[model samples]
Target: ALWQFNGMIKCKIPSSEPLLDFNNYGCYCGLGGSGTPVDDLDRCCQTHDNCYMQAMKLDSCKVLVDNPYTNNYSYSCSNNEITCSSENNACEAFICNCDRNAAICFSKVPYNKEHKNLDMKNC
Candidate 1:
């Protein structure tokens, strides 16, 4: 799609979650979400109360760079959103999935800065 640069946007559960009980899927196996993108079915199970993963998506501000993974993400609890950006240009940000629990949240990447005099069209 759109001259893809990535191998593909693969959606899967992070290996960090405990799901050892699963025969092939997860540790908890029955309860919580597993095997793929954090689906709604990830209900409470015996082992883990909530099986979840952060699913972030960028808004329609086409990035200047060719790669999205390299894009920086900034999580601001005060703003209740996750920003997608290329270092210091203009890009759109989206609401983080853990807005209600933003207090406990953190990002693997650093946040971006306010972009000034941006060529809105090039966003």
Candidate 2:
């Protein structure tokens, strides 16, 4: 589900009709892409909100005061590959376990120091 929020203000100027001024705008929590596992045993789910929370927990996510954006937001949760376990709810869940593992693998790499500029040409 996608949610959007915004604030508007009514403004009136001389010799002009009233106008609506957009004050604040924000996007509500939303789900992201879903993918099938390579083994075709399970599906992967991704969400902006969930990722942001996970990143925050790891001290990797950052909130910019000057900019209305969240940086380094990511999350992954792993589960078993099965039809649909009630205890784990792999199928019903928004994201699959494999996807989380992928994120973990990618994050393990120390890109900050190894490739600060990310210039693959040097590699």
Candidate 3:
């Protein structure tokens, strides 16, 4: 199945099937392969993809901002924010989880020292 969110297209693989390798996958915005992710931080985006999809299945999170032309996008729950809390709905929590994890991964990487000058085609 195909799922589009936060300006990215994700293909969902059935749980019954073998998992596909994401090693060849690179982070992109608007469309796959259209832009480069900071350094090899594509791993962060990949993990977020999984988290978002899982939330999607449960109607927990949803894309709140989607402006592909401006290369801006974001997701949020009914609260219109991505803040995790014990009282939050599944969607809200996962939405925060996805962004939180990505931010953590981005901070640990050295994209600032390398590939900072790359002309990104999309966000």
Candidate 4:
């Protein structure tokens, strides 16, 4: 099932650049980004990665959940539904926009080349 797919990818950032949140690098089913990108799609992820950090700066990561059985689990923006814990704000809207834009960018890129798998890794 498409629902069974995962979206985690590794991103290798240098020592000089520090991240505000832990596990903020590398693309995944939850949030953050992966190592250096190899194409426009990966770059999309990088921007979205920072977008998450920016959103978090406005608030905390309290709205998203991790449990698979629950309704509020943090998930890919490309998916149809956008579920949050409760009342939404700029933090939630910004995060949603980040994913939505990323998904749009992802669709514009050509995918014939053998680059990376989007649904192979886990957080």
Candidate 5:
């Protein structure tokens, strides 16, 4: 019915932001974020929007850390497990895909938020 159409359209409005996160949406069997499957689908879309918002908060669109293959940053990477910093110097953040791709990295910064996202710009 048109009522269902209206509910689905609620999340697809172009340029208009999601009213809220779709954490409560999912499948008809409980994944439907809410009691209704329609709302669950809508919630899925909303969650995508929220994820986009989160990435933008830190300008994380670009690769920040450097490839953790050629740096000797005073620290070491043995089992694809090494923590880097954001201080920028002898010890800065960077990826460690050397185990497979030589470019595995981390970072999901929110400014107030902190992480060891990779970037060897200075390392």
Candidate 6:
């Protein structure tokens, strides 16, 4: 079965040095190396470690209702939907390109890696 939670969760990126051009293409550096780069539509959530991570990819940026009877959900991302560059802009911002079809999903209530048993609904 699947459960859902609503509301915006505050996420913070921690780095001794400020990330240059953080908001240019709507991508932000994730807290740990795991989150790395997050797309504009991605939501940030605090994991069990009390650290933040990108909750969703570009495609699955909206809330979803899962089938409790089947305990299953589906997720998909368009190939080459996201791209990053090493070059910096005049504003010194990082650049990211996203296609319309990139996204992510989870079956568990509070998404976390430790809860592997919950099942990966989609990516």
Top candidate, metric TM-score:
4
The per-candidate count of clashes, in order, stands at 6, 4, 1, 9, 18, 4
- Candidate 1: lDDT over CA atoms? 0.24
Query: Which has the higher lDDT value, candidate number 3 or candidate number 6?
Result: 3
Residues 54-87 of candidate 2: C-alpha lDDT, one tens digit per residue:
6434321233221112111222222421221234
Per-residue CA lDDT of model 5 for 1-123, tens digit only, reads 112212222323323222232222232111212232233243333343343334334433233443222333333334433333344242222221111111121111111111122122312
Of the candidates numbered 4 and 6, which has the greater lDDT value?
A: 4
By lDDT, highest first, what's the ranking?
4, 3, 5, 1, 2, 6
**Candidate 2 displacement at residue 27 in angstroms:** 23
Candidate 3 C-alpha error for residue 17, in Å: 40
Error of 4 at 36 (Å): 2.8
lDDT of 1 by residue, 4-120 (tens): 101110112123222221212222223232333221122122112231222222333343442332433343222323332344333312212222122122122122222112223
- Quote the lDDT for 43 in model 5: 34
Cα error, candidate 3, residue 104 (Å): 0.6
Q: Give the whole-model CA lDDT for all candidates, comma-separated.
A: 0.24, 0.23, 0.40, 0.41, 0.26, 0.21
**What lDDT tens digits, residue by residue, belong to model 3 across residues 1-123?**
112132121112222111122223344311344444644556565566666557666632345332212222234333222333576445555555565555455445443323332345433
Model 6 steric clash pairs: 21-93, 59-102, 59-103, 60-103
Q: By descending TM-score, how would the candidates be arranged?
A: 4, 3, 1, 5, 2, 6
Model 5 TM-score relative to the real fold: 0.21
If scored against the real structure, what TM-score would every candidate get? Answer: 0.21, 0.19, 0.43, 0.46, 0.21, 0.15
- Residue 47 error, candidate 5, Å: 0.6
Q: Alpha carbon lDDT of residue 45, candidate 3?
A: 59
